[PDB]
Amino acid sequence: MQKSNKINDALNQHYKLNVELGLVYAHYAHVADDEFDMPYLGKFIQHLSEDKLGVHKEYISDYFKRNGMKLKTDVSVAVKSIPSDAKALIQEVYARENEVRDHVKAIAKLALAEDDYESFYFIQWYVRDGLKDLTEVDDVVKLFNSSNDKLIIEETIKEMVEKESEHEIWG
Amino acid sequence: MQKSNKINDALNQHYKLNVELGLVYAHYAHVADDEFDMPYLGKFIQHLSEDKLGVHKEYISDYFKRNGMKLKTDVSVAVKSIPSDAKALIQEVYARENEVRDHVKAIAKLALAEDDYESFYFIQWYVRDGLKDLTEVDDVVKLFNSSNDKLIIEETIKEMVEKESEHEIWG
Amino acid sequence: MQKSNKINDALNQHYKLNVELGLVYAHYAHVADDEFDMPYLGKFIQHLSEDKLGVHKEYISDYFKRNGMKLKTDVSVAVKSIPSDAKALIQEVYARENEVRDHVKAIAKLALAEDDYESFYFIQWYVRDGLKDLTEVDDVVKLFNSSNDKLIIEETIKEMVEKESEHEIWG
Amino acid sequence: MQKSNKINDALNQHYKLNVELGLVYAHYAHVADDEFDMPYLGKFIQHLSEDKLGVHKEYISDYFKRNGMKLKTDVSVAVKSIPSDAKALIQEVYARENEVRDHVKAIAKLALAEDDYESFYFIQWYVRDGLKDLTEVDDVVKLFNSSNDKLIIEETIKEMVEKESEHEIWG
Amino acid sequence: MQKSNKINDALNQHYKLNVELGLVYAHYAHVADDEFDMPYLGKFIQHLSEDKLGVHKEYISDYFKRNGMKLKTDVSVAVKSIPSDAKALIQEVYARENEVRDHVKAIAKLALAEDDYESFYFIQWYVRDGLKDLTEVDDVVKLFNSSNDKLIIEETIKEMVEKESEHEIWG
Amino acid sequence: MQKSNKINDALNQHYKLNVELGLVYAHYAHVADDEFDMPYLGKFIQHLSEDKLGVHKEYISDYFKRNGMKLKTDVSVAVKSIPSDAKALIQEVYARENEVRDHVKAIAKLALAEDDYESFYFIQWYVRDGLKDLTEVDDVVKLFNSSNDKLIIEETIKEMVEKESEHEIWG
Ligand SMILES: [Cl-]
Ligand SMILES: [Cl-]
Ligand SMILES: [Cl-]
Ligand SMILES: [Cl-]
Ligand SMILES: [Cl-]
Ligand SMILES: [Cl-]
Ligand SMILES: [Cl-]
Ligand SMILES: [Cl-]
Ligand SMILES: [Cl-]
Ligand SMILES: [Cl-]
Ligand SMILES: [Cl-]
Ligand SMILES: [Cl-]
Ligand SMILES: [Cl-]
Ligand SMILES: [Cl-]
Ligand SMILES: [Cl-]
Ligand SMILES: [Cl-]
Ligand SMILES: [Cl-]
Ligand SMILES: [Cl-]
Ligand SMILES: [Cl-]
Ligand SMILES: [Cl-]
Ligand SMILES: [Cl-]
Ligand SMILES: [Cl-]
Ligand SMILES: [Cl-]
Ligand SMILES: [Cl-]
Ligand SMILES: [Fe+3]
Ligand SMILES: [Fe+3]
Ligand SMILES: [Fe+3]
Ligand SMILES: [Fe+3]
Ligand SMILES: [Fe+3]
Ligand SMILES: [Fe+3]
Ligand SMILES: [Fe+3]
Ligand SMILES: [Fe+3]
Ligand SMILES: [Fe+3]
Ligand SMILES: [Fe+3]
Ligand SMILES: [Fe+3]
Ligand SMILES: [Fe+3]
Ligand SMILES: [Fe+3]
Ligand SMILES: [Fe+3]
Ligand SMILES: [Fe+3]
Ligand SMILES: [Fe+3]
Ligand SMILES: [Fe+3]
Ligand SMILES: [Fe+3]
Ligand SMILES: [Fe+3]
Ligand SMILES: [Fe+3]
Ligand SMILES: [Fe+3]
Ligand SMILES: [Fe+3]
Ligand SMILES: [Fe+3]
Ligand SMILES: [Fe+3]
Ligand SMILES: [Fe+3]
Ligand SMILES: [Fe+3]
Ligand SMILES: [Fe+3]
Ligand SMILES: [Fe+3]
Ligand SMILES: [Fe+3]
Ligand SMILES: [Fe+3]
Ligand SMILES: [Fe+3]
Ligand SMILES: [Fe+3]
Ligand SMILES: [Fe+3]
Ligand SMILES: [Fe+3]
Ligand SMILES: [Fe+3]
Ligand SMILES: [Fe+3]
Ligand SMILES: [Fe+3]
Ligand SMILES: [Fe+3]
Ligand SMILES: [Fe+3]
Ligand SMILES: [Fe+3]
Ligand SMILES: [Fe+3]
Ligand SMILES: [Fe+3]
Ligand SMILES: [Fe+3]
Ligand SMILES: [Fe+3]
Ligand SMILES: [Fe+3]
Ligand SMILES: [Fe+3]
Ligand SMILES: [Fe+3]
Ligand SMILES: [Fe+3]
Ligand SMILES: [Mg+2]
Ligand SMILES: [Mg+2]
Ligand SMILES: [Mg+2]
Ligand SMILES: [Mg+2]
Ligand SMILES: [Mg+2]
Ligand SMILES: [Mg+2]
């Protein structure tokens, strides 16, 4: 039952991605509120930031504890430009979440190629969450095409953030 | 992350199958009660009808919303003969549920061949449910071989329909 | 007390109409959400779909059980074009509900012509519901002429769908 | 939908392994308490014994009921030597749980090779549980390297056994 | 107060008998449900299986802890034929429980011959339980001579299994 | 009321320090559990990690929103060596917290030199917390000099982490 080095490498990279994404989202949350005057968009993006810096990274470190894989912490990220408006801000968040689905798909494929069924089981959470997170971000992108009034958009985001739930399949 | 057309095709076909099955089961439920004098068999088959026309089809339409796949509605079904008695009615329901397991297996195999891990995750619900639904139908088929008294069979179905649960694995 | 064949025919046709309408509405609900970015319009139309595929058809099958009429299941429906925008989507729903009132009126007239007072009683539910359903759809059509902001319309539909009631006359 | 004989064989073997493991663990639990004066270690190992002789074997027999596979009961186990001390006792439990992960991995691989997606679904429980059980045993092995005082180790095991929970992923 | 070797031998043999009986009953429970279509008979026999593999064996191991007797685990059992129908299945369970009473009687006689009054006290539980268990099995055997309808028998077993009790004498 | 650039610079640097510290502590928490077999030390260090990545950084971003200061995200941290044992791990945490007090003192001094009384008020939280956090870490360092038994130390940390409070002055 020796751990896969390739999976170890791919999951360390995914740990890194979730840390750096979380740090960028925290900046984007500040910017949505501070410069675009959209505090509820900020809260939406802040929750996603805390999601990436929270369970997304912690489940990997916990997995590594269980199977002998080695954790690496190697983090480099700088927010050097900002999208020009709130719509492009959330569209960028959408693009990054779409890349998450792509990275996660590669890990699922690699786990089967390695006959690492514990890792294929483990990554199912991330397969499900890749689509759930994208859907939630997509629900906010839509609003900027449905109204030209920032305060109307903000009121619709407020409900989304303040909604209490889980889809049977997508969580 | 472009959606698979083959999976899109297979899931549209499975949507269609669940609609048409649900419509046939609704007819069979009427017939069990009206012509075979087995109202609890009717209720059992009606619940299955509502299961197929409900979450079985709605989960597919919801999935399509999330990933860009296209929904098609193309439905053609006619109930042109009826099984001759209640035993053969439920045996036909059993045969159709067995085909469901077969169709679902093909989709699972196709998702792996396409490296579509979101679709392989999605279909696990249907893999589990294929066997759960078959088991529930099988539990009713058994009764017709265990007693020659319709009212005794009906009393045993009543309990089954009125039972409040979920197996850890099969749901 | 022999059952009317003409009423049997007209009610089988109305069963068919409610099945096929329900299937079209389920498609329209998907489209409202997925392509027009109006999830609450989708939920409104989904509820109507489940109404047609639910009590509207089940009351007919139950009636047939009581009086010897024969149920037929013969269903053919394909959604081959979509209205171009959300306003035209609900306007189409409105047009189909208006045809429902017309079909139901014919059955009421036929029941009196046949001196089938049980069927005239039975159809009163559908006479009342024809106008109630049209009124509910009409309440949504109005919104697209009252605002050019999709998110404002969506917020008004949300309240309608989330409202807890029954008019003394129209139910 | 004919059942796989190879999977049937592999799951009968896994049934056997869980029975025989459970019987050995019951002996080890007696020994931990009776000869090593570690009643809480005994209770920890007894719970694992009841886990193997309980759901681990019963889920297989239940699965076989659902799909036509044949159950075999063929059990041969004799506890002919005992590890020399409590540390080596739990280390042996650890080694056997590590072999469980290996046997379970083979079944997962075989289910995919057989395109037996119901069996691949079924075995996911055992894939998850292979790592959870190993982790729990590993948590006890650690204690013998962290203290040379048996009563201190016993107090830490007591808390573990008396703890009321489930990881989102590993259960 | 040196422990009796003969009693030690007889109680190790009785431990073995309860393990092997429990394993056979678990197979019989599967068969009652799976092949004879009698799930409540299966549950009845499963409870007996868990009774033998539970307190019946655990009380012996606990006794051995208290008095210096040595536990042996030496288990060999294979289910190589099945009774032909449900009636003969429970009749076989009855025959094995009757042998339990006989084995237990020998231990009681041996304890008095050895002036081992702690062991005579200990075995009183098994003397009482030998007759209680036989009575419970006998109550099920009776049903197959009282009705030729499997579903009627199943309904009577359901009540027995779902009954909440203890006789002042026989427990 | 123009914002101080020097304070803006010093608080951006302190934001960076709290991010990078939080990431290092998350690694140290993994290591305490995984390699040093001290899960409660791990939880202690994980809580500190979440403290630094949480309110410590978020209060700064919130302050910047209120006064026109500019947030910068520029993060570079790599965990390239690990302390050799648990005692040196917490001693390193202690050294880093001591540097926090030093950095915070510089900001307080700078705010007075700039007559930036809003920033002097703001930083009082960090002045208080610098000493509270150090005290909490110091309470754990002490344990490694008070016992040579890892499990005894772990039990004392457990209480600390599971304690429900606030000093009137130090919080
Ligand atoms: Cl840079
Ligand atoms: Cl903007
Ligand atoms: Cl994109
Ligand atoms: Cl690969
Ligand atoms: Cl036809
Ligand atoms: Cl019949
Ligand atoms: Cl079949
Ligand atoms: Cl394929
Ligand atoms: Cl067509
Ligand atoms: Cl539109
Ligand atoms: Cl019209
Ligand atoms: Cl007319
Ligand atoms: Cl041997
Ligand atoms: Cl020892
Ligand atoms: Cl090992
Ligand atoms: Cl294989
Ligand atoms: Cl043999
Ligand atoms: Cl039988
Ligand atoms: Cl006998
Ligand atoms: Cl004797
Ligand atoms: Cl470096
Ligand atoms: Cl250490
Ligand atoms: Cl220092
Ligand atoms: Cl200064
Ligand atoms: Fe604000
Ligand atoms: Fe969330
Ligand atoms: Fe723009
Ligand atoms: Fe997430
Ligand atoms: Fe509002
Ligand atoms: Fe409002
Ligand atoms: Fe509101
Ligand atoms: Fe509100
Ligand atoms: Fe009825
Ligand atoms: Fe159900
Ligand atoms: Fe027949
Ligand atoms: Fe189902
Ligand atoms: Fe009854
Ligand atoms: Fe009864
Ligand atoms: Fe009853
Ligand atoms: Fe009842
Ligand atoms: Fe939605
Ligand atoms: Fe309504
Ligand atoms: Fe238009
Ligand atoms: Fe209606
Ligand atoms: Fe409003
Ligand atoms: Fe509102
Ligand atoms: Fe409101
Ligand atoms: Fe409201
Ligand atoms: Fe004890
Ligand atoms: Fe457990
Ligand atoms: Fe040793
Ligand atoms: Fe387990
Ligand atoms: Fe202590
Ligand atoms: Fe204690
Ligand atoms: Fe305690
Ligand atoms: Fe306690
Ligand atoms: Fe069953
Ligand atoms: Fe009992
Ligand atoms: Fe016989
Ligand atoms: Fe007993
Ligand atoms: Fe009865
Ligand atoms: Fe009854
Ligand atoms: Fe009853
Ligand atoms: Fe009852
Ligand atoms: Fe742990
Ligand atoms: Fe704290
Ligand atoms: Fe040292
Ligand atoms: Fe702090
Ligand atoms: Fe304590
Ligand atoms: Fe203590
Ligand atoms: Fe305590
Ligand atoms: Fe305590
Ligand atoms: Mg392969
Ligand atoms: Mg491949
Ligand atoms: Mg007239
Ligand atoms: Mg293949
Ligand atoms: Mg004498
Ligand atoms: Mg001055």
Q: How far is the CA of A39 from the centre of ligand 25 (A)?
A: 6
Pairing state between β D74-78 and C74-78: unpaired
Buried b (16+ CB within 10 A) or exposed e, D10-21: bbbebbbbbbbb
- Amino acid in position A36: F
Nearest residue to E48 (alpha-carbon basis) of E94, E105, E114, E103: E94
Pair D21, D52: CB distance under 8 Å: yes
> From CA B141, how far away is CA B124, in angstroms rounded?
26
Pairing state between β F74-78 and A74-78: antiparallel
- List the single residue in B with minimal CA-CA distance to E152: B152
Residue length of chain A: 171
Contacts of A144 (CB under 8 A, 6+ apart): A86, A87, A90, A153
Residue length of chain F: 171
Q: Does F19 touch chain A (CB under 8 A)?
A: yes
> From CA D109, how far away is CA D123, in angstroms rounded?
10
Tally Cβ neighbours within 10 Å of residue C99. 12
Tokens standing for A103?
């990275």
The CA dihedral of C21, C23, C28, C30, to the nearest 10 degrees, is: 160
Q: Which are the residues after which chain F is interrupted (C to N > 2.5 Å)?
A: 164
Count of alpha carbons within 13 angstroms of residue D18, beta-carbon side: 27
Pairing state between β A74-78 and C74-78: unpaired
DSSP per-residue letters across E52-94 = IIIIIHHHHHHHHHHHTPPP--EEEEE-----SSHHHHHHHHH
Mutation test of the interface with chain B: which of C16, C27, C30, choosing the one with the most B Cβ atoms within 10 A?
Answer: C30
Contacts of B131 (CB under 8 A, 6+ apart): B101, B170, D66, D67, D118
CB nearest to F149's CB, from D139, D142, D149: D149
Tokens standing for D24?
């050995």
Nearest residue to C58 (alpha-carbon basis) of C68, C69, C71: C71
Chain A nearest-CA distance from D64, in A, is: 22
CB nearest to B152's CB, from E38, E39, E151: E151
Q: Does E6 touch chain D (CB under 8 A)?
A: no
Q: Do D30 and E72 touch (CB under 8 A)?
A: no
Cα torsion angle, C54, C60, C64, C65, sign: positive
User: How many separate helices (H) and strands (E) can be counted in chain B?
Assistant: 6, 1
Pair D90, D153: CB distance under 8 Å: no
> From CA F84, how far away is CA F87, in angstroms rounded?
8
Tally Cβ neighbours within 10 Å of residue A162. 9
F75 pairs with which residues across the strands? A77
In three-state secondary structure terms, B167 is coil
Q: How far is the CA of C55 from the centre of ligand 11 (A)?
A: 24
Nearest residue to A134 (alpha-carbon basis) of A86, A106, A93: A93
Q: Which CA distances in Å does B129 have to B161, B165, B167, C167, D122?
A: 17, 14, 11, 41, 12
Q: Phi first, then psi: what are they for C16, rounded to 5°?
A: -55, -45
In three-state secondary structure terms, F72 is coil
Pair A61, D167: CB distance under 8 Å: no
Q: How far is the CA of E21 from the centre of ligand 57 (A)?
A: 23
Burial of residue D98 (number of CB atoms within 10 Å: 0-12, 13-18, 19+): middle
Q: How far is the CA of B99 from the centre of ligand 7 (A)?
A: 7
Distance of CA A43 to the CA centre of its chain: 15
Cα torsion angle, B75, B76, B78, B83, sign: negative
Burial of residue A57 (number of CB atoms within 10 Å: 0-12, 13-18, 19+): buried
Q: Which CA distances in Å does C28 have to A146, B14, B34, C58?
A: 19, 19, 34, 22
With vertex at residue B14, the alpha carbon angle to CA B9 and CA B16, rounded to the nearest 5 degrees, is: 95
Q: How far is the CA of B110 from the centre of ligand 4 (A)?
A: 17
Contacts of E145 (CB under 8 A, 6+ apart): none
Q: How far is the CA of D78 from the centre of ligand 37 (A)?
A: 48
- Amino acid in position F141: V
> From CA E93, how far away is CA D101, in angstroms rounded?
36
Contacts of A30 (CB under 8 A, 6+ apart): A42, F61, F64, F65, F71
**Orientation angle between helical segments C5-34 and C57-67, nearest 10 degrees:** 160
CB nearest to B23's CB, from C19, C24, C30: C19
In three-state secondary structure terms, F80 is coil
Chain C nearest-CA distance from A89, in A, is: 19
> From CA E106, how far away is CA E7, in angstroms rounded?
10
> From CA F63, how far away is CA F67, in angstroms rounded?
7
Which chain A residues contact residue C38 at CB under 8 A? 146
> From CA E105, how far away is CA E113, in angstroms rounded?
12
Contacts of C40 (CB under 8 A, 6+ apart): C154, C155, C157, C158, C161
> From CA B28, how far away is CA E81, in angstroms rounded?
41
Whether B contacts A, i.e. 3 or more CB pairs less than 8 A apart, is yes
Nearest residue to F137 (alpha-carbon basis) of F83, F165, F100: F100
Q: Which CA distances in Å does F123 have to C89, F104, F128, F165, F168?
A: 58, 8, 9, 22, 18
Cα torsion angle, A59, A60, A64, A65, sign: negative
Q: List residues, by chain if needed, whose CB lies under 5 Å from ion ligand 11.
A: C 95, 98
Q: Which are the residues after which chain C is interrupted (C to N > 2.5 Å)?
A: 164
Pair A16, F27: CB distance under 8 Å: no
In three-state secondary structure terms, F78 is strand
Q: Which CA distances in Å does F115 have to C21, F12, F13, F15, F120?
A: 73, 19, 20, 22, 9
> From CA E147, how far away is CA E86, in angstroms rounded?
13
Buried b (16+ CB within 10 A) or exposed e, E45-58: bbebbbbbbbebbb
Q: Phi first, then psi: what are they for C78, rounded to 5°?
A: -140, 130
> From CA C86, how far away is CA C76, in angstroms rounded?
25
> From CA D39, how far away is CA E48, in angstroms rounded?
28
Tokens standing for F64?
């910047």
Pair E10, E106: CB distance under 8 Å: yes
Q: Does F35 touch chain D (CB under 8 A)?
A: no
Count of alpha carbons within 13 angstroms of residue E69, beta-carbon side: 25
Question: What technique determined this structure?
Answer: X-ray
> From CA B133, how far away is CA B78, in angstroms rounded?
23
Burial of residue F9 (number of CB atoms within 10 Å: 0-12, 13-18, 19+): middle
Q: Which CA distances in Å does C158 have to A144, A157, C153, F149?
A: 19, 14, 9, 62
Radius of gyration of chain A (CA): 17
Pair E43, E70: CB distance under 8 Å: no
The CA dihedral of A32, A38, A44, A47, to the nearest 10 degrees, is: 60
- Amino acid in position B47: H
In three-state secondary structure terms, C7 is helix
Please list the alpha-helical segments (H only) found in chain F.
Answer: 5-34, 39-51, 57-67, 86-113, 117-146, 150-162
- Amino acid in position F89: L
- Amino acid in position F62: D
Q: How far is the CA of E17 from the centre of ligand 35 (A)?
A: 46
Per-window interface: B 131-160 vs C, CB < 8 A: none
> From CA F144, how far away is CA F137, in angstroms rounded?
12
> From CA A147, how far away is CA A159, in angstroms rounded?
16
Whose tokens are 């759960």? That residue is B132
Q: Which CA distances in Å does C113 have to C107, C110, C129, D145?
A: 10, 5, 22, 94
Distance of CA F115 to the CA centre of its chain: 27
- Amino acid in position F145: N
> From CA B43, how far away is CA B102, in angstroms rounded?
26
Q: Do D152 and F154 touch (CB under 8 A)?
A: no
| Consecutive H or E run containing B93 | helix B86-113
Tokens standing for D99?
């072999």
| Consecutive H or E run containing E147 | none
SS (H, E, C) chain D: CCCCHHHHHHHHHHHHHHHHHHHHHHHHHHHHHHCCCCHHHHHHHHHHHHHHHHHHHHHHHHHHHHHCCCCCCEEEEECCCCCCCHHHHHHHHHHHHHHHHHHHHHHHHHHHHCCCHHHHHHHHHHHHHHHHHHHHHHHHHHHHHHCCCHHHHHHHHHHHHHCCCCCCCCC
Contacts of B107 (CB under 8 A, 6+ apart): B7, B10, B11, B14, B119, B123, B126
DSSP per-residue letters across C47-116 = HHHHHIIIIIHHHHHHHHHHHTPPP--EEEEE-----SSHHHHHHHHHHHHHHHHHHHHHHHHHHHHTT-
Whether F contacts B, i.e. 3 or more CB pairs less than 8 A apart, is no
Which chain D residues contact residue F152 at CB under 8 A? 147, 152
DSSP per-residue letters across C89-104 = HHHHHHHHHHHHHHHH
Q: Which CA distances in Å does A118 have to A56, A130, D104, D123, F119?
A: 17, 19, 10, 11, 51
CB nearest to D145's CB, from F37, F154, F155: F37
DSSP B78: E
Q: Does D165 touch chain F (CB under 8 A)?
A: no
Q: Do B109 and D115 touch (CB under 8 A)?
A: yes
> From CA B13, how far away is CA E41, in angstroms rounded?
42
Whether A contacts D, i.e. 3 or more CB pairs less than 8 A apart, is yes
Pair D131, D151: CB distance under 8 Å: no
Count of alpha carbons within 13 angstroms of residue E9, beta-carbon side: 5
